[PDB]
TrEMBL record, chain B:
WD repeats lie at residues 12-53, 61-95. It comes from the Eukaryota. Transmembrane segments: none annotated. Belongs to the WD repeat PWP2 family. The chain holds residues 453 to 565 of 904 of the full protein. This is Periodic tryptophan protein 2-like protein.
TrEMBL record, chain E:
It comes from the Eukaryota. GO terms for molecular function: RNA binding; structural constituent of ribosome. Keywords: Metal-binding, Ribonucleoprotein, Ribosomal protein. InterPro entries: Ribosomal_Su5_D2-typ_SF (IPR020568), Ribosomal_uS9 (IPR000754), Ribosomal_uS9_CS (IPR020574), Ribsml_uS5_D2-typ_fold_subgr (IPR014721). GO terms for biological process: maturation of SSU-rRNA from tricistronic rRNA transcript (SSU-rRNA, 5.8S rRNA, LSU-rRNA); translation. Mg(2+) binds at residue 125. GO terms for cellular component: cytosolic small ribosomal subunit. This is 40S ribosomal protein S16-like protein. Pfam families: Ribosomal_S9. Belongs to the universal ribosomal protein uS9 family. It comes from Chaetomium thermophilum (strain DSM 1495 / CBS 144.50 / IMI 039719). Transmembrane segments: none annotated.
UniProtKB/TrEMBL annotation, chain I:
This is Nucleolar essential protein 1. It is found in: Nucleus, Nucleolus. Keywords: Methyltransferase, Nucleus, Ribosome biogenesis, RNA-binding, rRNA processing, rRNA-binding, S-adenosyl-L-methionine, Transferase. One of its GO terms (cellular component) is small-subunit processome. Pfam families: EMG1.
UniProtKB/TrEMBL annotation, chain J:
This is 40S ribosomal protein S28-like protein. Belongs to the eukaryotic ribosomal protein eS28 family. SUPFAM superfamilies: Nucleic acid-binding proteins. One of its GO terms (molecular function) is structural constituent of ribosome.
Length: 17, 113, 192, 57, 126, 101, 50, 49, 226, 61, 42
RNA sequence: CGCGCGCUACACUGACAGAGCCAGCGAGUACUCCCUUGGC
């Protein structure tokens, strides 16, 4: 689930930016 | 043994005699043993099963080698012949009997021709 | 000849499975199955007592017709008899040829190609299948389809294997195998 | 997966521009590139982003 | 003097002694001939060494073979083995060793068991 | 009503009077393995004959009104010809090169 | 379709022998009780012996 | 009794008893042939009563 | 084409022997059935109303009646008289009941329940004069007997509304039809989805499985012209 | 509705897949730069061919 | 205690050959043979 | 009576007649299934 965790976090940070 | 910690890891076993010459396949998938129990032995270690495949030979083993292309092994046994195998399909693919191709002799106190 | 019977000395030339059938020009069609239907090496009968299952994928180095006979020796009343197994396959290949006048090896390999399903469901999603399991699955389906039709019927094991494999070669809708693959793949499409 | 790739690239660009844990950043950068060295030279929109990360790094 | 090669082959419990000397060319089993001794389907497995080797090799020598022990298919693999190790040993000891090594290449590259009684003992997954 | 062998010499085909036509293999002698049976006509067949070139096609003129070409591997007849009005009870293929089908 | 009539007992309970000939039935149930008596006495006798 | 068959050690013995009941009373019985071999009765044999 | 000679003898309509998958046909599955044993009688609301009202777990589920009448309907249906019909029952212990066409069950619930009890303790039901096991207990998966070329369908409420006649005409040339019908009284539709491709609603009304299967079966008899 | 040939180039271990499925990364036989990730059951080898049908989705777990 | 030392008694491992609904230890070897030995004494 | 554990039966992998062709372990002066009609 690990890379998936960082995938969603990446997605969230894109929305943040 | 583990390099990074040093304390012993695994005594592999299976051998009907002392183990004569050893090498890793250069990718690191396979450990190969040859022992004087007429036999050479494919130890796949880093797989999750730590499996073993035998290879019956004709006589004792003396030296092992790999190909940089890690598919092929070359084992040099006691009659003198080389036997050349492909690792995956554990089938012998080549052989050279080189006894007269290496005999040079007649030492001191060597009373055979 | 030293001592060799007449048909074999007549075909002293190259390899001929069963002393009747050639390996020379056999086409695969699925490039995914090329590596796994190993037919480059010949064999003379399919009873070649190699240890093709010590570790992984070496069952994909057995020549396929040995595998076919193997699958034939599978259910609880028919375990050991590999000799009856290759006898069955022998009679099957005679029948396939007499009904097709064709290279029955090319027939069989065609039947494997057309039978091997390509995606299946997992409890449920649907994923692709390895070519190795395509091969395995197809042989299993072919054999079990054959004997299951041969169950209480006068048509025996050889002839039902003959029919099932001819149909599965043809891809038509009358073989157990093609039907079962079709339903499996429709379930795969259904869930997707 | 590859859709996730260029956003990660932009994050690494931000990392290098505001540099921090720079060995980590270089390390994961090179991993991405080597494991997909073909698809990056297939795409186009990487180009400007890769120039940014080049200059910053 | 009179040439002789005496070879062994082996399987689970068959034992195949075979003697290979100069002669007309016949091939025999216990005192009966070759195409007859079998479970009558496996005679291809018997034929295989002659058919790899080409009979123009074999038309020099005579091959008695004895067998006992074990069931049919054991016996059969034994006989093919003693056939092969026979004819390669006779080529080793009474014609050119280069034809030995070329013959051994043909044989082994076909299969390994035709020269080596590579047996089955027990070693599962430990 | 007609029992004829394929130009191999290994196949005999023949048609009964209930309407089924059977095809079965024979070696030289005591071999009667019933390869296939077809049960389409429901009415006697009088002439089934092989195409003297192709091993897999055979004509079958039935009782009723019909002649038709079968392929051996096929489980339904390849082509069907009509036009006849009474029993049909003799037939043949056309020898000659351009006399193909 | 030529349908059929199921053969079955209305008064169903798992335990009870169902058979036409009460003679053979009583033979069976006598034999069963006899077996029970034999093994019961045997078990009691062995344990008394030990 | 008198022996019925004789294997290596374990010997069946027949004409001593009239029932398995009598035997399993004499379970573990200290038996002794004339020649002086000692021994033990262990189970009743089933098929000839 | 010739006009296809007229038969001079009436037809017997032998049903499909179970080895055959080839015959496009109709499979029905009374799923979610309530076939429960009591002491020795099926558990129903008739007498065990007080028992289940004392033990406080949904008196309304122990309804073997719906199964009985659905079965009776699908027995005396003329597609069953033709043999294009075969019945399977799933009861809530997970029991598969292969129901041959050639049976006639007695019409009443009491002889019925006695017969099902005999079933539930001998895994098979033999007939009077014929040796063949009339009602036969078999094993999940039901797919292990279902036809290969078919559409495992279930009726439902929230699914779209499609007319049965055009759906059975949508059914292909060689393909049978498998329907999962819910003999349960009150509950959701999830009882079969592990096999079912698609759920269907057939009318705007809410019904029972008896009229569901009768409408459905008569529609098949329409489209295959019985 | 085409069919696509593809080849497994590298087989993952630690995705946390469920049951007999493993994730794997494949490069297209057609556009040998385009590379995606799919899930698959059956013993499956590095550097080998696989047929697929739906070329749309990156597979989840 | 009586549970997690289950060998105070016997049960079948299977569960019932037939579920029947109307309203598990299978007897105790240890107390049984104990009571009996007291009787064989007395 | 409950309970499994072993043995038997249950059919297409059939039945009858032939033909042919293969094991390994076992040697205490020791080995027996009856029990009965007759007669010597």
């Amino acid at each position: 689930m690990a890379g998936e965790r960082i995938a969603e976090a990446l997605e969230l940070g894109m929305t943040d930016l | 043994w583990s390099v990074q910690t040093g304390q012993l890891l695994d005594r592999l076993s299976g051998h009907e005699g002392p183990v004569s010459s050893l090498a890793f396949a250069p990718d690191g998938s396979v450990l190969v043993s040859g022992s004087w129990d007429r036999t050479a032995r494919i130890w796949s270690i880093f797989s999750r099963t730590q499996t073993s495949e035998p290879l019956q030979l004709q006589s004792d083993v003396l030296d092992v080698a790999f190909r940089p292309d890690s598919k092929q092994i070359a084992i040099s046994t006691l009659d003198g012949q080389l036997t050349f195998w492909s690792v995956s399909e554990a089938q012998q693919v080549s052989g050279v009997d080189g006894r007269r191709d290496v005999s040079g002799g007649r030492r001191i106190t060597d009373r055979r021709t | 000849y030293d001592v060799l019977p007449k048909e074999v000395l007549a075909e002293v030339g190259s390899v001929k499975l069963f002393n009747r059938w050639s390996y020379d020009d056999i086409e695969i069609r699925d490039i995914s199955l090329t590596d796994y239907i190993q037919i480059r090496a010949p064999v003379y009968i399919p009873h070649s007592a190699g240890r093709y299952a010590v570790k992984r994928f070496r069952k994909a180095n057995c020549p396929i017709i040995e595998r076919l006979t193997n699958s034939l020796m599978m259910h609880g009343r028919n375990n050991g008899k590999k000799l009856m197994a290759v006898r069955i396959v022998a009679h099957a290949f005679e029948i396939i040829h007499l009904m097709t006048d064709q290279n029955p090896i090319q027939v069989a390999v065609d039947a494997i190609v057309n039978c091997g399903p390509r995606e299946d469901s997992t409890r449920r999603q649907a994923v692709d299948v390895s070519p190795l399991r395509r091969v395995n699955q197809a042989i299993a389906l072919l054999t079990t389809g054959a004997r299951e039709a041969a169950f209480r019927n006068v048509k025996t094991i050889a002839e039902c294997l003959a029919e099932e494999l001819i149909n599965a070669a043809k891809g038509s809708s009358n073989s157990y195998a093609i039907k079962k693959k079709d339903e499996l793949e429709r379930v795969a499409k259904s869930n997707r | 997966p590859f859709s996730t790739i260029p956003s990660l690239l932009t994050f690494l660009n931000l990392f290098a521009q505001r540099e921090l844990n720079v060995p980590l950043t270089c390390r994961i950068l090179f991993f991405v590139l080597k494991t997909h060295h073909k698809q990056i030279v297939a795409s186009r929109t990487m180009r400007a982003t890769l120039e940014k990360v080049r200059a910053n790094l | 003097s009179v040439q002789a090669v005496q070879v062994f082959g082996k399987k689970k419990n068959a034992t195949a002694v075979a003697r290979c000397v100069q002669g007309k060319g016949l091939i025999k089993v216990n005192g009966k001939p070759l195409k007859l001794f079998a479970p009558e389907i496996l005679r291809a497995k018997l034929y295989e060494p002659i058919l790899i080797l080409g009979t123009d090799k074999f038309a020099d020598v005579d091959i008695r073979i004895r067998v006992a022990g074990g069931g049919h298919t054991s016996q059969v693999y034994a006989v093919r083995q003693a056939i092969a190790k026979s004819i390669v040993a006779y080529y080793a000891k009474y014609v050119d060793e280069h034809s030995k090594n070329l013959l051994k290449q043909e044989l082994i590259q076909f299969d390994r068991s035709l020269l080596v009684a590579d047996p089955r003992r027990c070693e599962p997954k430990k | 009503h007609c029992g004829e062998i394929r130009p191999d010499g290994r196949v005999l085909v023949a048609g009964e009077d209930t309407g089924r036509m059977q095809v079965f293999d024979v070696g030289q002698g005591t071999r009667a393995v019933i390869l296939k049976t077809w049960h389409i006509h429901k009415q006697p067949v009088w002439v089934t004959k092989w195409s003297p070139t192709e091993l897999t096609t055979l004509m079958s003129c039935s009782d009723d009104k019909t002649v038709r070409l079968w392929d051996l591997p096929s489980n339904d007849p390849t082509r069907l010809f009509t036009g006849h009005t009474d029993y049909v009870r003799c037939g043949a293929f056309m020898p000659g090169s351009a006399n193909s089908n | 379709i030529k349908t059929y009539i199921p053969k079955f007992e209305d008064d169903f309970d798992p335990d009870k022998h169902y058979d036409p000939n009460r003679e053979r039935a009583e033979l069976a149930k006598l034999k069963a009780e006899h077996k029970r008596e034999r093994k019961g006495a045997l078990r009691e006798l062995r344990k008394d012996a030990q | 009794g008198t022996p019925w068959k004789i294997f290596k050690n374990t010997a069946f013995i027949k004409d001593m008893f009239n029932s398995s009941l009598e035997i399993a009373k004499f379970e573990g019985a200290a038996i002794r042939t004339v020649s002086g071999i000692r021994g033990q009765i262990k189970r009743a044999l089933s098929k000839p009563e | 084409p010739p006009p296809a000679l007229p038969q001079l003898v009436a037809e017997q309509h032998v049903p499909i022997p179970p080895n055959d998958k080839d015959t496009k046909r109709l499979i029905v599955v009374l799923s979610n059935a309530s076939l429960e044993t009591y002491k020795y009688t099926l558990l129903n609301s008739d007498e065990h109303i007080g028992i289940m009202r004392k033990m406080n777990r949904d008196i309304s589920d122990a309804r073997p009646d719906i199964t009985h009448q659905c079965l009776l309907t699908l027995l005396d249906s003329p597609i069953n008289k033709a043999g294009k019909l075969q019945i399977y029952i799933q009861t809530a212990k997970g029991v598969l009941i292969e129901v041959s066409p050639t049976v006639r069950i007695p019409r009443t619930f009491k002889r019925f329940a006695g017969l099902m009890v005999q079933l539930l303790h001998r895994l098979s039901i033999k007939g009077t004069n014929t040796n063949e096991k009339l009602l036969k207990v078999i094993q999940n998966p039901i797919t292990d007997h279902l036809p290969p070329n078919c559409r495992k369908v279930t009726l439902s409420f929230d699914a779209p509304l499609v007319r049965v006649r055009d759906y059975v005409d949508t059914l292909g040339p060689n393909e049978s039809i498998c329907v999962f019908v819910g003999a349960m009284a009150k509950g959701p539709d999830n009882f079969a989805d592990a096999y079912v491709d698609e759920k269907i609603s057939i009318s705007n009304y809410s019904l029972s499985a008896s009229v569901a299967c009768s409408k459905f079966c008569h529609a098949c008899e329409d489209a295959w012209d019985i | 509705a085409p069919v696509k040939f593809v080849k497994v180039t590298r087989v993952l271990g630690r995705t946390g897949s469920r049951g007999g499925v493993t994730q794997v990364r494949v490069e297209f036989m057609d556009d040998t730069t385009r590379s995606i990730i799919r899930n698959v059951k059956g013993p499956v080898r590095e550097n080998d061919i696989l047929v697929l049908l739906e070329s749309e989705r990156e597979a989840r777990r | 205690r009586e549970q997690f030392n289950p060998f105070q008694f016997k049960t079948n491992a299977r569960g019932p050959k037939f579920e029947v609904t109307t309203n598990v230890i299978k007897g105790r070897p240890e107390l049984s043979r104990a009571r009996s030995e007291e009787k064989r004494r007395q």
